Design a protein around this ligand. Structure first.
Ligand code: HEM
Ligand code: HEM
Lengths: 484, 484, 483, 483
């Protein structure tokens, strides 16, 4: 077999014994194989993601199947176009080897390696989120994560924060339902959550929501099943997916879009760009199908180093003015400059399948081969012209610069409708899980949280208020003042 | 209450809404509060420890109680001397938020903030280790850790490695016994593993092993109890410890030493500086007592950032020539330069309780206030004399520089001793756990592993061979050729 | 006091490594050798991407006027005295580059105010070369040494600048003798952009800041530059540190130029264009600064200071100048990298008021947190905002867009500047610019010369001769340019 | 080709940021503005702790002797052609520091051999100032600019060197005109230390390496230094890059001086003392190097190359020189920080042979691993060692120790050097040392003078004059110094 070498290519003569000053003597500083193997070892780890640290990556392909040229000019949506993908599924709060049975929303991020560049659709199984403005994301994550004093879960903290956040009511209803503990990533849907802005070749815009429909169906664990699985397997989602792909049982999802024109936004009773809302009566249209059929070759180089970011957009796809999405356009590229580095987008899993041509340079571990003296634009010696067809869409403005919440909140209606859509057994599990989680919250926050659940549906609030030992008369009088 | 501020101290006007271009417009880049909060958030995480990433830190005090001036000049051992400590307990292989029920050795690292500087005793509950030379450490960890292709446990990998490592037999016997799954950190002992060299005021040396004897007793979980605990609690060791301290029930450990003179080592049939060995008949002497009685204030600032390293030594305590230990003198300080930074030892939790006076300077995030022009030694303007009493001890040398295994291995005797010391019930649990783990290893490595167990004790090897489905006749013939 | 390791243990020998016998190899277990070398091996951090070469000093600012109608900031309250940290610098070259190299010179002032830290990061030139921060990286890459060799190559800047008529004014300032100061004490400081001051009623004013040197202005001419460089590559640092050591403390008066929001539309140029001065707006004195103390340690203080236009206090906000808007992001961003997440907690960067927020962890966090409340809002440990500190509201119209400003006036002020120079000052300018332009590609060179010609026919004509451009092509090119 | 963003998407407008209307603020969603500024903000990495100012060129080495009796290394096989990367540098000052400043000049060569990459990291000076690596951080700290002001302050290095008599020989080379070369092309290079060469029979030889310039040696005297500095702060880079552009490729012959292990105890000095040359050992030529190609990109190649004495191939090992021993640790260590754990996988650092080991992960890992076997040994995917590559064995005796070498001889070789200088060179040497020593504290100054006086009474006497030392004290201190 080929000889073991050091990183400079030199063969190693003994990989079992350190060089010592005699049989009973100390180790020498000059043993370069010892030093190099330990300095590499000592530097293998990089920071985990600040959220969604626990994840599983797989590869597959997406094939478009409809004519949506009237909605978007992006080549990924052209009927019959087959684009390779990289998908990273994940939980949200806990560290990287945390039990996959822990209750949480699950991430569903798809990197499309399109012919116009890489587009990332960074979604979750839940179609709505807990907040509507990215300025609260650091606050929200800090409240959800383990207590900073102990590294132990302490749910009284998320309910202190969330008692000030009535808009979280619908998504907390998902979290504490059995949708919070899936049986496999193959048995969950995916949603973009926000409305994205699709732009056609005439410069016209449509606001669109994306949904991945599982062709395997939806399968969740109930709290007693969660405990049985957790007893022997702390990686059941990863085992399920990797194992399925090894057996050739490739999971698939159909992609659907819901569409609104800019002039329809103001007609609704809720704000269509509020990330805490679904669009209940807008029809869905199928535009493609993705199949995930290949495992990764190396977890660290692919799954750990993949950089998913809503900022990775192609002409024809832009962010909407959803205020949650707006901060996401900054945050992922920013964190990835730190987690990976300035040259993170040049790693194999992050590279586009098209040419990159710009003046960005240098930075740590630059692996390029540059020969030109022109790293500026414009240049008449080595021009790099822009493409006028790729200019951003123009959105009309009015009012003033401002710091004010959106005007139509409707914080409790959709939560109530979701609660009522649940089977009797689903409601029972949601009520017992939410109540157990809320039981030792401070009394003031506890009765305020329970007022939101009661305003969503009196049966929901009454039952969680019994489990959590809240004060039902205070819950009802607080709920009476809440506005629809 | 005090107004929320930005990091430059300027008060914040609205922490709930980002600044937007009208009520329906996009978010502005000039919103410095949004951008600061997101950039700080985006940079919260640092690399986890390459091993022992899952850990719990607490604080307490150690009080010495014997006259060991004959063995060491170090102040921490002076009778009645009280020294504050920081202890970090941990598992080894998996990451943060991995289940604390996972089978593994457990770390027991004590930072003593002595009156002569900080001394770290970085030990484990197991008194022996799997390998005896630090050049194999990276290989050993890579074999134990989850498969690099999938991030899932795959014990065929560790047994392909350990089939070439007959010296791992005794510690794999501890690993697969119920000592591999403790009921609490308070119910385990701690050991230095290596002999350390204590030096007295005359410059004379003694080799000593350290043992923390639990005053709460030893309590382990058997396989069925592990699954039951894991079903509901993935942080059972942290909860147990933080819990006890909150209730005032402070865990204690008596510190004992085993002592051998330099001239006695050659008389043993095993090498006393072999990390795979205990010293079976050397008497123990109690030298002090440690009580852990305070939880940390902030997990990140203290438990995550603490830097435990065998290199943090004080005059009177030095590393022995144990070849595993020698590598550890280099590796912890090296990985901390990366994980923390060049200024990592100036963080609050890592600072000594005595003055630091040297020419080490600059480096990222230097928080000092230097006024001198003298950052070199020697200097006649601002001298920094050495202390001739702190010169290292002189060890006699013989032979040549070399790369060769130690001359006495005795790889199976102590492992058989350990097996035979176990109760019938403990034997059954060991055999079932080891055999289930080994069952899908490649046949050649599996029968070689079994031969090691059979040579330790024929009953051990026969029973694990039945559970693992190895070939007994091949096991017996391979064992017949093994040497004692 | 005895020499120690970083753990506080005393060192027994700091002159000899531990070796295996008199003729033998060095031992891995010598922890003093390893810890000194590992710290030494990690002393350096990335230099600033621009302005790497700099000098820092400390002093104090005292406000002297009632400007409460313009800003509610406590720093400007007449009589208020505020400690300052100032960093002066060059722009293009590395940290030990000669201080005589031709460049704009930075003048950044960190005010440790009673409302928090406010940084006024300006330059001695009152105008900049570009007017939209999206071009900053390109501009800097064209100015810096050639990426192939690390050697100055002025044809690269004129290839870029031939597309940028808006750089005419400041290029005139660069190639003049103001491009090579005699001391930092002998130069003015300008904020360049208009900032928006907001008073206690919420009213806004657009203001320009100017530091007037009370030592006067003193530039070196070309011949004096080579003379000084021959023996001194740190002449600016030497002058300032030496002057403070002798007790000759340099002082600057701070002046403001003021405009109301409804006045911006009435000029022939865009008042928020960073390549423009405000020629006819009167100046008012609002305070004075004295720099009277040298630093204790260059690295801890001068190298680690983090100056950023985003360090704002109530009463001061960015204007819509498109150059400034980019700077509000870039400084804080690069400091997260060059220093780290906890860079603003280093001694030189800390404010003199408490910091109260949920920002946490990050590399080398030196705090002492005990609370479980790292989120807002909380009813257990609230951290209320102050409604009085809400940002001002600017009226908007039109659409989101990617389009240059409409009033450019790229040559007029460039010409006024040229013609304002003495005959000798003009001669030096023409020769420095023309020598720098000489080997630019012919198309860029004659386009550059057209911008100078459009500014002032004598200017363009004299540089064309030195630089060897085609006078007739310059004149026809200039014919097609708009004032 | 069309400009793109880093994800490959085409840019529609690289001239204007996206704003909220023509007079409105910039938008956070303009991903091109943010990605360009984020990349620009992170361009710089930490400069080398020493030798930050450098120039890199490429070339080829051709072996021309049969030295298989001394080393089994393929690089030295007669007729063997190996590609090289060479980086020349100054030592003490930061990037863009004047290349005329007085220092030793680095001469590092990376040989991309058929057995792996071998780096010969040398200098023009054949000796060094100190002899144990434990003092290296102290020495560098004393040599660099004062930590309080970032200005050169030569009193600091003499405070330090007044305790270091062994630096006399190299301080003599430093203050001579060898300290200011006219080009890297006109300077020799030396490995300084003895290296251990090992042949195919396991036999060892101690060897010194010397690169003989085939352009001759060309220095600048103090008056010429000032002239070049007045106008050129990159004279060495210019000279070397320009020479190669013209086709005038510089050449160096490689020579070795050989000693057997039993010969080291014979001499009156220690042959592994880095402050010593080997005066009477003869030199044999073993090959020639020609540098004939410039780099394509300065940052990717010259800034990112990783030169380290730890990059060894079979046939070559460190000797027991105590300064060399620390260098085996420190270069790889600083490169783990300056570059990263994956720094040896960058294009310029990669070997021309396959790398096969279980080193993995780390920041920005660009590999394409498929195996699950990242440990050794393995019976599934074995990675056997080669017994012929085992390290050589050195006989030991004594005990572990912290004690200076015994045969110091700190002054004789320095005096020898001085006496070989022409009258011109002696006067230049004397004026510079004296001028640098001038404001040192009297006690250190007179002790430095004693060392010079002990090397040679005229040296001592002539430098004590310029520096204003006290000759009677110098002579009585010198009286007591031993040979
Ligand atoms: C609709 C709401 C959101 C969804 C669906 C979502 C989804 C996700 C997913 C799936 C990932 C993991 C991607 C991967 O597998 O690598 C992730 C990571 C992340 N998210 Fe979000 N998230 C949302 C809200 C936010 C917000 C509001 C912010 C901040 C402004 C944010 C910041 C981050 C960060 C910093 C990471 C780590 C990325 C990395 O290190 O590569 N997210 N998110
Ligand atoms: C007797 C054998 C060993 C014992 C008892 C042991 C114990 C420990 C413990 C208790 C910790 C965690 C300290 C904490 O809580 O921060 C640790 C971490 C670590 N150990 Fe060991 N270990 C052993 C062998 C080794 C060897 C041979 C090496 C390498 C030569 C090594 C390298 C490391 C590293 C790099 C870390 C991470 C340190 C950090 O990031 O702060 N260990 N070990």
């Amino acid at each position: 077999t080929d000889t073991l070498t050091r990183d400079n290519g030199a063969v190693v003569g003994d990989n079992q014994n350190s060089q010592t000053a005699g049989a009973q003597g100390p180790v020498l500083l000059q043993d370069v194989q010892l030093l190099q193997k330990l300095q590499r070892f000592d530097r293998e780890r990089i920071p985990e993601r600040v959220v969604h640290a626990r994840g599983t990556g797989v590869k597959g392909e997406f094939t478009a199947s409809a004519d949506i040229s009237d909605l978007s000019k992006a080549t990924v949506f052209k009927s019959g176009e087959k684009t390779p993908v990289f998908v990273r599924f994940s939980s949200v709060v806990h560290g990287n080897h945390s039990p996959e049975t822990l209750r949480d929303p699950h991430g569903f991020a798809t990197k499309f390696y399109t012919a116009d560049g890489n587009w990332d659709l960074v979604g979750n199984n839940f179609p709505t989120f807990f907040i509507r403005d990215a300025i609260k994301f650091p606050d929200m994550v800090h409240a959800f994560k383990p207590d900073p004093r102990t590294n132990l879960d302490n749910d009284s903290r998320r309910f202190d924060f969330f008692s000030h956040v009535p808009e979280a009511t619908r998504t907390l209803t998902l979290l504490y339902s059995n949708e919070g503990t899936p049986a496999g990533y193959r048995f969950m849907d995916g949603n973009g959550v926000h409305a994205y802005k699709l732009v056609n070749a005439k410069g016209e815009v449509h606001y669109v929501k994306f949904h991945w429909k599982s062709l395997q169906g939806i399968k969740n664990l109930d709290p007693k099943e969660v405990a049985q699985v957790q007893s022997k397997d702390y990686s059941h989602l990863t085992n399920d997916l990797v194992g399925a792909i090894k057996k050739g049982d490739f999971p698939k999802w159909d992609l659907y879009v819901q569409v609104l024109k800019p002039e329809e936004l103001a007609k609704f009773d809720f704000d269509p760009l509020d990330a805490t809302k679904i669009w209940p009566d807008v029809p869905e249209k199928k535009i493609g199908q993705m199949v995930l059929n290949k495992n990764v070759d190396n977890f660290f180089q692919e799954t750990e180093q993949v950089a998913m970011a809503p900022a990775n957009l192609v002409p024809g796809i832009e962010p909407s003015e959803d205020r949650l999405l707006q901060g996401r356009v900054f945050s992922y590229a920013d964190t990835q400059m730190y987690r990976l580095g300035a040259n993170g987008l040049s790693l194999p899993v992050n590279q586009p399948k098209v040419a990159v041509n710009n003046g960005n340079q240098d930075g740590a571990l630059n692996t390029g081969h540059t020969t030109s003296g022109v790293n500026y634009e414009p240049s008449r010696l080595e021009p790099r012209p822009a493409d006028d067809k790729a200019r951003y869409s123009e959105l009309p403005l009015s009012g003033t610069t401002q710091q004010a919440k959106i005007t139509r909140e409707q914080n409790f209606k959709q939560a109530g409708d979701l609660y009522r859509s649940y089977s009797a057994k689903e409601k029972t599990d949601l009520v017992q899980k939410f109540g157990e989680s809320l039981a030792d919250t401070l009394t003031e926050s506890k009765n305020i949280m329970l007022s939101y659940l009661y305003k969503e549906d009196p049966n929901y609030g009454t039952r969680v208020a019994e489990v959590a030992k809240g004060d039902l008369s205070k819950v009802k009088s607080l709920a009476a003042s809440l506005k629809d």
